[PDB]
Amino acid sequence: AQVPLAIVSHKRQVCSLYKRALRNLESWYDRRNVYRYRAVQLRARFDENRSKDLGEGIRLLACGQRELFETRHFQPRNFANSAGGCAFEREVIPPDWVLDYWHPLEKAQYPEYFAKREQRKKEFVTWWEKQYGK
Amino acid sequence: GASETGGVKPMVIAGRMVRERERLIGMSPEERAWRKQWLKDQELHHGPRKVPALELELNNPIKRFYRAPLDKVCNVLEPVLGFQRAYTVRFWTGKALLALTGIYAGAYYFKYNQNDWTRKGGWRVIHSRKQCVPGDEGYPKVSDRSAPSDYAARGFNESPL
Amino acid sequence: MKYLSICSISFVNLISMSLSCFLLSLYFLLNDMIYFIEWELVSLNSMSI
Amino acid sequence: EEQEFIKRKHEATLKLRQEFLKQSSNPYRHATGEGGTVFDAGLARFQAMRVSNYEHFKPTGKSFRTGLFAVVLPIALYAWALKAERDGREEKYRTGQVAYKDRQFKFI
Amino acid sequence: AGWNKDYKPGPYPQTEKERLAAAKKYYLLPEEYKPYADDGLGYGDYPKLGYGLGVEAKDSYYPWDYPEHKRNQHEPISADHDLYSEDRWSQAEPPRYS
Amino acid sequence: MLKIIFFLLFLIPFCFINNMYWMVQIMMFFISFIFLLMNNFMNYWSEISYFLGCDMLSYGLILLSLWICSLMLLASEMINKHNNYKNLFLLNIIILLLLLILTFSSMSLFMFYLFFESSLIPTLFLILGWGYQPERLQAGLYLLFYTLLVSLPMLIGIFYLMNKIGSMNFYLMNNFMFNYDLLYFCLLCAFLVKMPMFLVHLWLPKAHVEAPVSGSMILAGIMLKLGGYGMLRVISFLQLMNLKYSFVWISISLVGGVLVSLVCLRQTDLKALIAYSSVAHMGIVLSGLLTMTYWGLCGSYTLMIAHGLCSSGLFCLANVSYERLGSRSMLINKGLLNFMPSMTLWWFLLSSANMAAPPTLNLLGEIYLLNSIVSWSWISMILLSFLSFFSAAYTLYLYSFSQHGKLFSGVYSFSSGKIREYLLMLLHWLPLNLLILKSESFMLWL
Amino acid sequence: TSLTTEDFANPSPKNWQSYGFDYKDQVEDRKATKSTFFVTVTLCLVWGSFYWAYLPDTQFRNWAQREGFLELRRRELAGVDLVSPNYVDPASITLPSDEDLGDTEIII
Amino acid sequence: TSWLGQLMLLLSGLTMFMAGLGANFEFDLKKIIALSTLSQLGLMMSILSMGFLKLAMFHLLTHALFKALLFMCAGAIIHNMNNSQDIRLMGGLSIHMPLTSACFNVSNLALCGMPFLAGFYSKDMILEIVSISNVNMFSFFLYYFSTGLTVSYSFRLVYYSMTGDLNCGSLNMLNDESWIMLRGMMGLLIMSIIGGSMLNWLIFPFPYMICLPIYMKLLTLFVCIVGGLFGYLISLSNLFFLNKSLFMYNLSTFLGSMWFMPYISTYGMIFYPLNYGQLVVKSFDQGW
Amino acid sequence: PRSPMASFAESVLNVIDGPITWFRESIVEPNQQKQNWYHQRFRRVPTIDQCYTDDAVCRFEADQQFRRDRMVDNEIVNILRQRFEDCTLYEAPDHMVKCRPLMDQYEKATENWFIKYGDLGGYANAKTAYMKQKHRLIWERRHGPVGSGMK
Amino acid sequence: GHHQMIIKPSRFQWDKFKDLLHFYVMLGVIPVTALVLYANIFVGPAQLA
Amino acid sequence: PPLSLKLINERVLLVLKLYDKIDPSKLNVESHFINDLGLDSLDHVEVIMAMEDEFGFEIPDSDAEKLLKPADIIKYVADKEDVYE
C-alpha cells in the first residue's frame, strides 16, 4: 500500500482550505438551492486570487484560514458513518482467533464453517512465510 | 493433556484488511483476492445444527426433572399447534403458574407472619385511616385510637403477659 | 427462553405488572389509603436502618 | 531543507510498520497460546518511567514550592480549621452554655 | 521482553554525543528529542511529546499501527498521555474563544 | 475455639502428601462452615480456652480471614499448574492462617502483638517466593521494614502497661485512662502505619503491585485490618489522650483520602490503582474510628470487613487480565468486554461495591463513618463530599477504561475465562451482599 | 491435520477442555470442580445462610424489644419518667462537699 | 415554605428558558428532543416550588406519555436515514413516512398545547395557577415566554422534517413498513389522546377553581400561536435573506452551546484536578 | 360496595383470602403441636457504686447490667418514636393537633436518654456513666441547671 | 438461512458455570425446604406463656 | 443492502455526466481529470465533494490525491464498502 507523506504542498493547503470553506458553508446555509448559490460565489473568490504570486498567496491563506476559524459553525455537520460522526464505528469486531477457542461441541453447530477455516489456516501460513520471509 | 482449543491450532486469518484504513491506503492483488475469499466464507447457507450433546451438558439433572412435567404438555400439544405456538403455551402456563403461587405465598405471609412485638425483623405494616364518606357506615366516624398506647401496638395490647 | 425473544417474554411481564398496579392505584384513590410497610436491618442508639 | 527531515522520519517509521505486521500476524507466535502482546519499547519505556522518579528528584525549591502548597498547607490550614471550630464548640459545652434540650446530634 | 530496571530513563543528557544516543534510545530522530527542564522534578532524559491540543487532534485517517491509541509501533508515549488522551482533557479543534 | 486451631494444625501434613492441593481448600472451606456454626458471641469474651476467646469483633475478622485465605487457594491455581513449590506454598498459607486466627482470638494485648507481626514473615516469604517482577525485593523490604520500624517501639509501650495495669487482658485495661503523651504515639503510630495513613503509605503501592495474586489478597485482605483491629482495642484506654491529637489524624486521613483519589486518576496500572484505592477508603475507616463515637466504631468494623472482601476481589480480576494479556498496564488492557464479556459482569459488581454502591455491605459501613465524621465537625463535610465524589471518579475510570473501548491490537491469542475464575468471583461478591441481611451480627460488636 | 466437515460435527471424546482446576488428568479436573462447588455453595452459602436465619437470639435484641414494651407499660402506668435520667438515684449518691473538691476540675 | 423556594424557582426558570432557546439552534434530532424534555422539567420544578403537588405530579405523568412517543418516532426516522441525527439531512417525511409522521404529529401537538390533548390539560392548569398565585415578575415572563419558545422549536422541527423539501442523500432507505416498531408506538399514541382527560377526573378529588380576565387566560393560546408561526416562518429562507444566526455570530454560539455549560463542565474544569494528581505523585509519592 | 370497582375489588380479596385461610385452617394449624416459650427475667444486680476499685467480677456484673438497661432504654425511645410515627399516618391531614402530645413525650425521653447515656460514645460503661452523673450533680448544685452557664 | 457468522467469544464456560451453580444451590435448597417445611407445619411455633 | 460493483460504475459516471465542466464523450472509466478532461485543482476538489455526498462518507484530503481517474474512485468506494464482486 501507500502511507501518505506528511509534507503538504502549498497547492494542497489551498485545496484543503477550499474544501473546509465549502463544508462550513453548508452548515450555515443548509438548503441546497441556497447552498449552491453561495457555494458558487465562494468559488468566485478563489478565482479572483488564482492569478497571484505565492508569497502574496501566503498572506491570503493566513487571513483565509483565520476568518474560517473565526466563522466556524457551533455545530458543524459530519457524516454519521465516518470518523467524527455521531454513529462512527459503534460496533467492535474481535480478532479472528477468538473462534478457535470455542468448545468442540459449540463448533459442531457450524461444522462446514470450521471445516473451511482450517483449510484457510493451511494456506495462510504459506502466504505469511512468503510475505515476511518466514 | 487438556487442549483448550480442542486441537484446532488457533491463528489469525483475516490479516491486514480488517481495519478500514488499512484497506483504503492500498491492497496488493493477492490481498484483495484473500479479502474477497474471507467475506465469502462468512456467509452461512444453513442455520446452526442442533447438537444433542449441549442440551444435556447445559441442563443439570434437577432442572431436567423440575421441568419434566410441563414438557409433557409441550410434547402433547406440539403436533396440535406447531412447535413455536405450543412451546409458548408451555412457557406461559409455567412461568405464570409461579406468579400465581408467588402472590399466595406473599398474601399468606402478610396475614399471619407479619412483624409483631415479640420480634424485630419481619415486615411491619402501619396503614392509615380510610376515607369515610357519606353513605358509608356511621358517617360521623372518628379514629378509635386516642390514648398513646393505641398507636404502634404491634399486637402488644392483646398479649398475655 | 431459548425459543422466545427476551423482548417478547419481557413485554408480557411488565404490561401485566403495569396493569395490576393501575388497578391498585385506583383502589388507593377511592379509599385514600396510605400503606407503609418496612423491613428492618439493624438498630442502635434508639435508631433503625 | 526541513522537507527532507519529514521524509527521513517517514521512511524511518515505515520500517517499523513493516516489522509490526510481521510480529502482529505472526502465526507462530499466535501459535504459542502463551498469550501476551507484541513487544513494544514505547509502552515499556513509559511504564518504567511512570514508576521511577526519585532517581531524578532533587529538592530544587520548585519541587519544594510545588510540594509545599500541594499537600502540606491544605493539611495544615484545614487541620487548623478543625481544631479552631471544635475548640469554640467545645468551650460552650464545658462552660455549660447549651442546655441538653439544644444539644445537636444527640444520637450522633 | 526485559524489565523496568532495563528501561527506566537515564540521567538528564548533558552532551551532544549523549543527546544523540538518547534520541536513538527512544527511536526519535535527533531533532524531536527534547528532555524536560530538569528543574529538579524532571523525568530524567525522557522525551517531551504531545502537550498540544491532545491525542484526539491527531490525524484520524492516518493508518496508525495502534488506531485505538492513535500511536505507531515503537513510538514513545508522552509522560502525560493519561491527561491528553482522547477521553481526557483534549479537543479536536482549537477552542473558538479564550 | 481450640476446635479451629487443632483442625488447622493437623491439616499441616497435607502440605507434604502429593496431589493434595485441591483437598486442602475443601478442608479449609469446610472449617469455615464449621466455624460459621459457632456464632453465639457477645461484646464480652466467650469460649475461653487457656488464653483464646472470641467476641463479636474478633469473630467477624476471624471468619473473614478463613474465607479470604480459602479463596487464596482458588485464585493461585497457577502454582498448582506449574508445581512451583506448591507444597511449600501451601504450608505458607496454613501457617499464615494460624497466626491470624491466634491474633484475633488472643485475649491479651501482648499476645495480639506476638502474632500481630509474626504473621508478617509468612507474608514476606510469599512475596519473594512467588512474585514475578524483579521489584519484589525492593517491595519485600518496604513491607518488612516499615512494619518492624514502628512495631518494635510498640513493644515498649506494651510492657510499660504491665507495670501500671499489672496485666495485658483487654477487659482489665479498659478500667484505666492514661495521660502520657508519648505512650499515645507508641500504640497508634504503630497501627496508623499499617492502616495505612496517607503520608506513611509508601509501602502499600509497592507491596501490592509486586506481590503475587495470593499475596495481594491477604495483604489487602487481612493485613490492613490488623492495624484497624488493633486500634479498636487500644483507644479504649487512650480516650483522654485521643482528644488532644485526633484532629491531626482526622485532617491527614481526610485530606489524604482526597489527594490519593486524584493520584488514582493519574495512575496507569491496574494493580497500582486498586492499591491506591485501598488507602482512600482506609482513610475514612481511620477517620471514623478516631471519632470514637458509637457510630464511628460500629461503622469502622463493618467497612473493614466489606472493603477487604472487595479489594481482595478486585485483585482477582487484575490477576485474571494480567495472566493472559501479560501486562498490568491500563493501555494494554482495553475493551475486555469484547474478549471476555462474561468476565465484565464481575468487574462491574466488585467495582460498584468499591464505590459504595447498594445493596452491598460496603454502603452500610460507609453511611456510618460519614455520620460520625459529620457529627465530629461540620467542617468535615467539605472533603468528605470530595472524597466520596472522587472515590467514584477513579472506580469508573478503572472499570470503564479497562472494559469498554476498542480492543488492543498487539495482543496474541489467549484462553477465555474458566469456571474456576467465575466461581472465585462469586464467592467474593455474593457474601458481600447477603451479609446485609445479618448485619445484626457483624455490626454490633459494642 | 486437515480436519473434515465431520471431525467438527462428530465431537471426538478424546481431547477435553479443563474447568481451570487441572490441566493433566481429566477425571481429576472434574473431580475437583464437583467437590469444590459442594462445600463452597451447598454448605457454606445454602446451609450457612439458612442456619444464620434461624440462629437463636444471641445479642438479646429481640429480647430487648419485649422489654421495651413491658418496661414501658409498667412505668407509663407508674407515674415515672419513661427514661430515667439517673443511672442511680441522685439522693442515693453522696456528693463530695465543696471543701473536699479543692478546685478539682469539673466537666459536663 | 423557606428561602429554597425562592432559589429553586429562579434556577428552574433559567433551565426551562435556556433550553427553550437552545432548542431553536440545535440541529441534532435526538438532542432537540432532549432539550425539549429538559425545558419542561424546569416547568415542573418551578410550579413545584409554588407549593402544588398534583399539578407537578399531573404534568410529570403527562410528560412521560408523549415524550416517550417522540423518541420512538425519532428512532424509526433515524434508522431509516443513514444513522444521522441531523435535521439538515432530513425533509419531506410527511409523505415518505405516512404512519410515523402521523405518530409524531399527535405527540408534537401535545407538546404544542393543542386543546384537549395530553399536554394541554397539564400545561394549561399550570399556567393558570401561575397567574393566580403571588409570582415574581421575572418568573412570570419566563413561564409564558418559554411556552412561546416551546412551540417555536417544535414547529421549527416540523419544517426541517415534514414540510421542508427533501434534503437527504442520493441513496435513501425511506420506508415505513416496520410494524413491530409501530405496534408498540400505538400503545403510547392512544394514551396521548386520553391520558390528559382521564387523569383530570382521577388525580384531582378537589378540582382547582380559576377565574381570570380574558386577556391572560387567552395568553397561553396566543403565545402558542405566535410561537408556532414565528418558529415556522423564521425557519424559512431564500437566496437573498440574512443569515441572522451567522450575523450575530457571538450570540448564536452562546445560545447554540447551551451557554457554554458543556465546555465549562468538561473542558474548563477537568484540567485542574488531574494536574494536581501529577504534582502530588510527582512531589510526594516519589518525591518528598 | 357502592362503587363498581370496589365491588370488583372485594371479589379479588375473596379469591386471595379464601385459599390461604383454608390452607392455614386445613393443614398448618391443625397439624401443629402445643408448646410454650417464656421470657428472660434478670435479677437486678449491685450498681457500680457498690463495687470496689480492685475487683473485676463485680465491675463486670454491672457493666453487663448497664448495657442491657441501655438497650431497653435505647428502644423505649424507639417505641415512643413509632407512636408519633403512627399517629402522623393515622391522623393526617389533621395530625398536628394529635401528634403534638406524642412528640412531647418523645422529646422528653430523648433528653433523659441523652442525659444518661449521652456523650459517652462507644466504650461507655457503668463506670463512665456513673461518673458523668457525679460530675453533673456537682455542677448542678454549684452553677444550677445546665444551659444557664457558670457563675 | 443467509445468516453471517458473527464472531463472538465462547460462552460455554459461562453457560456451564450457570448450570453447575444452579444445580448445587438446588442440591441444598430441597433439604432446607424440607426441614423448614417439616418444622413449621408439624412442630410449629411455641406460645408466649 | 449490498452495493454491486456495476452500480458503483454507474453511480460514479452519473455524477460526472451531470457535472457540466466535463465532456460526456471523453468521460470514461480510464480518463484523467486534470490531464485529459482539463480539470483544475479546485475543480477536482468539487468532484470529490460530489463523490462524498454520492456515497456518504469522507474522502480524506490526503487520500484524494490518489483519485486521478474515475476508475480509481470506483476502486476507492469498492474498497471502503469491500464489495469486490
Coordinates of C-alpha atoms in Angstrom, one line a residue, chain H residues 85-263:
Chain H
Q85 CA -29.5 12.6 13.8
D86 CA -29.0 15.9 12.0
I87 CA -32.2 17.6 10.8
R88 CA -30.5 19.3 7.9
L89 CA -30.3 16.0 6.1
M90 CA -34.0 15.0 6.7
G91 CA -37.0 16.5 5.0
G92 CA -40.4 15.8 3.4
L93 CA -41.2 12.9 5.7
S94 CA -44.9 13.7 5.7
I95 CA -45.4 11.7 2.6
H96 CA -42.5 9.3 2.6
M97 CA -43.3 8.2 6.1
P98 CA -47.1 8.4 6.5
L99 CA -47.6 6.4 9.6
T100 CA -44.5 7.6 11.6
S101 CA -45.2 11.3 10.7
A102 CA -48.8 10.9 11.8
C103 CA -47.5 9.3 15.1
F104 CA -45.2 12.3 15.5
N105 CA -47.8 14.9 14.7
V106 CA -50.0 13.9 17.7
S107 CA -47.1 14.0 20.1
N108 CA -45.7 17.3 18.8
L109 CA -49.2 18.9 19.1
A110 CA -49.5 17.6 22.7
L111 CA -46.3 19.4 23.4
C112 CA -47.6 22.5 21.5
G113 CA -50.8 22.7 23.5
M114 CA -53.5 22.0 21.0
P115 CA -56.6 22.0 23.2
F116 CA -57.6 18.7 24.9
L117 CA -54.5 16.7 24.1
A118 CA -52.4 15.1 26.9
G119 CA -50.1 18.1 27.3
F120 CA -52.9 20.7 27.3
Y121 CA -54.6 19.6 30.5
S122 CA -51.3 19.9 32.4
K123 CA -49.7 22.9 30.7
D124 CA -53.0 24.9 30.9
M125 CA -53.8 24.4 34.5
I126 CA -50.1 25.0 35.5
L127 CA -50.0 28.4 33.6
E128 CA -53.4 29.3 35.1
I129 CA -52.2 28.6 38.6
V130 CA -49.1 30.7 38.0
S131 CA -51.2 33.7 37.0
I132 CA -53.5 33.2 40.1
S133 CA -50.8 33.0 42.8
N134 CA -48.2 35.5 44.0
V135 CA -45.4 35.2 41.5
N136 CA -42.3 37.1 40.7
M137 CA -42.4 39.4 37.7
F138 CA -39.3 37.8 36.2
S139 CA -40.7 34.3 36.8
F140 CA -44.0 35.1 35.2
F141 CA -42.3 36.3 32.0
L142 CA -40.2 33.2 31.7
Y143 CA -43.2 31.0 32.3
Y144 CA -45.1 32.4 29.4
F145 CA -42.1 33.1 27.2
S146 CA -41.0 29.5 27.4
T147 CA -44.4 28.4 26.2
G148 CA -43.8 30.5 23.1
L149 CA -40.3 29.0 22.9
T150 CA -41.8 25.6 23.5
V151 CA -43.9 25.9 20.4
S152 CA -41.2 27.7 18.5
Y153 CA -38.6 25.0 18.2
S154 CA -41.3 22.3 17.9
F155 CA -42.6 23.7 14.5
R156 CA -39.1 24.6 13.6
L157 CA -38.6 20.9 13.8
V158 CA -41.7 20.4 11.7
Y159 CA -40.3 22.4 8.8
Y160 CA -36.9 20.8 8.8
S161 CA -38.6 17.3 8.8
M162 CA -42.0 17.2 7.2
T163 CA -43.0 20.3 5.3
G164 CA -39.5 21.1 4.2
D165 CA -38.4 19.8 0.8
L166 CA -36.3 16.7 0.9
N167 CA -32.6 17.2 1.5
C168 CA -31.3 13.7 2.0
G169 CA -28.6 11.7 0.2
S170 CA -28.9 10.0 -3.1
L171 CA -29.5 6.6 -1.6
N172 CA -32.3 6.8 1.0
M173 CA -33.9 3.9 2.9
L174 CA -37.1 5.9 3.4
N175 CA -39.7 3.2 4.5
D176 CA -42.5 2.9 7.0
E177 CA -43.3 -0.8 7.0
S178 CA -41.8 -1.6 10.4
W179 CA -44.9 -2.9 12.1
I180 CA -43.1 -4.4 15.1
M181 CA -41.8 -0.9 15.9
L182 CA -45.1 0.6 15.1
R183 CA -47.4 -1.5 17.2
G184 CA -45.6 -0.6 20.4
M185 CA -45.9 3.1 19.4
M186 CA -49.7 3.0 19.1
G187 CA -49.8 2.0 22.8
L188 CA -48.4 5.4 23.6
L189 CA -50.4 7.1 20.9
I190 CA -53.7 6.1 22.3
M191 CA -52.7 7.3 25.7
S192 CA -51.5 10.6 24.4
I193 CA -55.1 11.4 23.3
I194 CA -56.9 10.3 26.5
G195 CA -54.1 10.4 29.1
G196 CA -54.9 14.1 29.8
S197 CA -58.6 13.9 30.4
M198 CA -58.6 10.6 32.1
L199 CA -56.2 11.8 34.8
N200 CA -58.1 15.0 35.4
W201 CA -61.1 13.1 36.7
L202 CA -58.8 10.9 38.9
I203 CA -55.8 13.0 40.1
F204 CA -58.0 15.9 41.5
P205 CA -60.5 14.9 44.1
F206 CA -60.9 18.6 44.7
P207 CA -60.6 20.4 41.3
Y208 CA -58.8 23.8 41.3
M209 CA -61.0 26.8 40.6
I210 CA -59.8 29.6 38.4
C211 CA -61.4 32.9 37.4
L212 CA -59.0 35.2 35.5
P213 CA -59.5 38.0 33.0
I214 CA -59.8 37.1 29.3
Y215 CA -56.6 39.0 28.4
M216 CA -54.5 36.5 30.4
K217 CA -56.4 33.2 30.1
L218 CA -56.0 33.6 26.3
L219 CA -52.3 34.4 26.7
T220 CA -51.4 30.8 26.7
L221 CA -53.1 30.1 23.4
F222 CA -51.9 33.4 21.8
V223 CA -48.2 32.9 22.6
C224 CA -48.5 29.3 21.2
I225 CA -50.0 30.8 18.0
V226 CA -47.2 33.4 17.8
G227 CA -44.6 30.8 18.6
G228 CA -45.8 28.3 16.0
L229 CA -45.8 31.0 13.3
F230 CA -42.6 32.6 14.5
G231 CA -40.7 29.3 14.7
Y232 CA -42.1 28.1 11.3
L233 CA -41.8 31.4 9.4
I234 CA -38.3 32.3 10.5
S235 CA -37.2 28.7 9.7
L236 CA -37.9 29.5 6.0
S237 CA -35.2 31.0 3.8
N238 CA -34.4 32.3 0.3
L239 CA -31.5 33.3 -1.8
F240 CA -31.3 37.0 -0.7
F241 CA -32.1 36.8 3.0
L242 CA -29.8 37.5 6.0
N243 CA -28.3 34.5 8.0
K244 CA -29.3 36.2 11.3
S245 CA -27.7 33.3 13.2
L246 CA -24.4 33.9 11.4
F247 CA -24.6 37.7 11.7
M248 CA -24.9 37.7 15.4
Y249 CA -22.3 35.0 15.5
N250 CA -21.2 35.5 19.1
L251 CA -24.8 35.3 20.4
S252 CA -25.8 32.3 18.4
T253 CA -22.7 30.4 19.5
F254 CA -23.6 31.3 23.1
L255 CA -27.2 30.1 22.7
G256 CA -26.2 27.2 20.5
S257 CA -23.8 25.9 23.1
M258 CA -26.3 25.9 26.0
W259 CA -24.5 28.9 27.5
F260 CA -21.1 27.0 27.3
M261 CA -22.2 24.6 30.0
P262 CA -20.7 21.6 28.3
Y263 CA -17.5 23.5 27.9

